[PDB]
């Protein structure tokens, strides 16, 4: 076996490296230190970390968001500390339970939710700048910042664009562990079963596909670690036996193959499309489709099955039936 693919047998220690950026080099705060156990399966140097304006901005907004959530959550167990710790998962900060339309909700009915939602948004904006800037400072392309943009856009879609599009804040996502989960079921039920939404299908396709692709890619690189396949940048600008062998494994298996660069493009693209397909699905929901199952039925896509127990008429439609 190649044990290096499992863990690093002999760890190297050497003086730490700093790659100078176009700016902010004075903001790299901290001393590197080295975890020996971490070093077995990763780089052992933890730290330093860059601060910077957008990063600090991000932490400011983000923490404000968190204070509003945790304060409303504390209110929910009436500021009992032990009940707070016990019930934490169940606790949440909710959107309007009443239909105020696009009216700014009272603080007690979704007002705080909208606030925390706004600060979280600013938090994500600031962080995006940080993620985009650092690439530019270091002379890198902005591929990551664009993959991140798609992800933020999704969040905005379920957070406020869809609520806006249909004209109700009542539809946004609660903050809380079980509450943001319950929303998933409330929203699918309201919109006629999200399994029958094509873009839900697309998104899962790409998500499963990211699993397929990162399993196959990560495995492919460990399998040619002996030939220095991990050094992917110089395998791009100067093809070596690593990625000749990686390509041929795949060609001989599935009939076509990528290159060591293009496979990262496939990966990036699959990643991106999880969030892009998801957004499109949400922009269409409520706006133009009300019941995704019926929409499939309308277009002929839906499966249908025999009765097993007897077919059951709607009692409400029986004549003489109450209300």
């Amino acid at each position: 076996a190649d044990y290096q693919t499992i863990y690093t047998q002999i760890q190297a220690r050497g003086p730490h490296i700093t790659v100078s950026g176009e700016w902010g080099d004075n903001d790299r705060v901290g001393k590197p230190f080295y975890s020996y156990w971490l070093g077995k399966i990763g780089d052992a140097q933890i730290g330093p970390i860059y601060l910077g304006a957008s990063g600090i901005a991000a932490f400011a907004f983000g923490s404000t968001a968190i204070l509003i959530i945790l304060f409303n959550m504390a209110a929910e167990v009436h500021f009992d500390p032990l009940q707070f710790f016990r019930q934490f998962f169940w606790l949440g900060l909710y959107p309007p339970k009443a239909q105020y339309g696009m009216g700014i909700p009272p603080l007690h009915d979704g007002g705080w939710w909208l606030m925390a939602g706004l600060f979280m948004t600013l938090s994500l904006g600031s962080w995006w700048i940080r993620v985009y800037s650092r690439a530019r400072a270091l002379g890198l392309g902005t591929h990551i910042a664009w993959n991140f943009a798609a992800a933020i856009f999704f969040v905005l879609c379920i957070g406020c664009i869809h609520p806006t599009l249909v004209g109700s804040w009542s539809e946004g996502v609660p903050f809380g562990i079980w509450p943001h989960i319950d929303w998933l079921t409330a929203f699918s039920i309201r919109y006629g079963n999200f399994y029958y939404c094509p873009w839900h299908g697309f998104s899962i396709g790409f998500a499963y596909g990211c699993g397929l692709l990162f399993a196959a890619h990560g495995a492919t690189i460990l399998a040619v670690a002996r030939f220095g396949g991990d050094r992917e940048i110089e395998q791009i600008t100067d093809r070596g036996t690593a990625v000749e062998r990686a390509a041929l494994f795949w060609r001989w298996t599935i009939g076509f193959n990528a290159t060591i660069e293009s496979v990262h493009r496939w990966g990036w693209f699959f990643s991106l499309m999880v969030m892009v397909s998801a957004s499109v699905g949400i922009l269409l929901t409520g706006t133009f489709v009300d019941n995704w199952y019926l929409w499939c039925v309308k277009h002929g896509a839906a499966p249908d099955y025999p009765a097993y127990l007897p077919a059951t008429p709607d009692p409400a439609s029986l004549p003489g039936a109450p209300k």
Binding site: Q83, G101, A186, D290, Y308, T312
Partner: protein
């Protein structure tokens, strides 16, 4: 925190759809044994002599019973509702016609309610029917009743912890969660749906595209309605000790026909039935009950699905005493 196999499973939908019940045998047996305590029918008596309307002083509901019959009914009522207390729970020792004690007057209304259920709600209770035992289970206060707030423990024969006490505000989310099968759904399906007929349970549209005129802004129902309907269904499921597929093909919760089992249509009637009971028999009894009976807004304890079913898809596993006590209905 797990339940050893085997599990009992049934099939309630076309094969390959994963519809049916999943039961833990020890649990089913334990409920089986609890429901087995249903006293048997008292032996039948011969119908000799005058309607007790002539015979007794103050018999309104059961006036057409001969004496022996009427006394059989009273013996049954006593073992169903107040066996530890005996006859005097409702009666003055020395005057059996005295309406002095409130259990008397409540019990009279309860005879009417009970005969209503068996006569007027056969679409739910069918030919199984209910008796006083179905809810009371041998105590005056039925073990599973609902107030206008969530209360804990669900079985009121158990003793509250401090946090469970309705007064303890920090225990609210837990009070609500244990009513909705441990979910965090921030809604009480009892006061919303079952106490009265004001709210509508269906939330899912019946057209593929949004109808212009109900689909934007204040025209539309808030999404909170969907969470509430989900909460009500968690609670219905836990109350009958079952899961959604007992009643729905989750493919389309909102469809009937082949997408729903007969048990769904029966559940539909039970919702109508429970609202009738609450609105027309049970909630009014706050007028006749001691303050010790009433909740924090002066409400009489009322009924949900659990009050009868107590964790079983048919109360008491379908046991019946309808033929044994026709006094209690159906009244032709």
């Amino acid at each position: 925190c797990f339940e050893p196999p085997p599990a009992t499973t049934t099939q309630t939908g076309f094969r390959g759809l994963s519809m049916g019940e999943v039961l833990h045998p020890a649990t089913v047996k334990a409920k089986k044994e609890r429901d087995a305590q249903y006293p048997p029918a008292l032996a039948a008596v011969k119908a000799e002599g005058p309607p007790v309307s002539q015979v007794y002083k103050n018999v309104k509901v059961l006036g057409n019973l001969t004496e022996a019959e009427f006394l059989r009914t009273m013996t049954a009522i006593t073992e169903w509702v107040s066996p530890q207390e005996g006859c005097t729970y409702c009666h003055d020792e020395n005057n059996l016609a005295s309406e002095a004690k409130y259990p008397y007057v409540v019990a009279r209304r309860m005879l009417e309610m009970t005969r209503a259920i068996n006569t007027n709600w056969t679409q739910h209770v069918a030919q199984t029917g209910v008796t006083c035992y179905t809810c009371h289970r041998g105590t005056p206060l039925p073990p599973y009743v609902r107030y206008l707030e969530p209360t804990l423990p669900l079985n009121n024969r158990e003793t509250p912890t401090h946090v469970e006490r309705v007064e303890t505000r920090s225990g609210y989310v837990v009070r609500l969660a244990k009513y909705t099968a441990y979910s965090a759904l921030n809604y009480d399906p009892f006061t919303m749906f079952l106490a009265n007929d004001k709210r509508q349970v269906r939330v899912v549209p019946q057209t593929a595209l949004p109808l212009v005129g109900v689909s934007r802004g204040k025209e539309r129902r808030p999404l909170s309605d969907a969470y509430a309907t989900f909460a009500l269904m968690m609670s219905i499921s836990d109350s009958l000790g079952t899961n959604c597929t007992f009643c729905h093909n989750a493919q389309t919760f909102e469809s009937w026909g082949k997408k729903s089992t007969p048990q769904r249509a029966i559940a539909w009637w039970g919702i109508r039935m429970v609202r009738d009971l609450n609105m027309n028999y049970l909630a009014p009894l706050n007028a006749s009950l001691p303050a010790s009976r009433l909740g924090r807004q002066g409400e009489a304890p009322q009924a949900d699905c659990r009050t009868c079913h107590q964790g079983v898809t048919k109360p008491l596993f379908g046991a019946s005493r309808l033929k044994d006590y026709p006094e209690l209905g159906p009244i032709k």
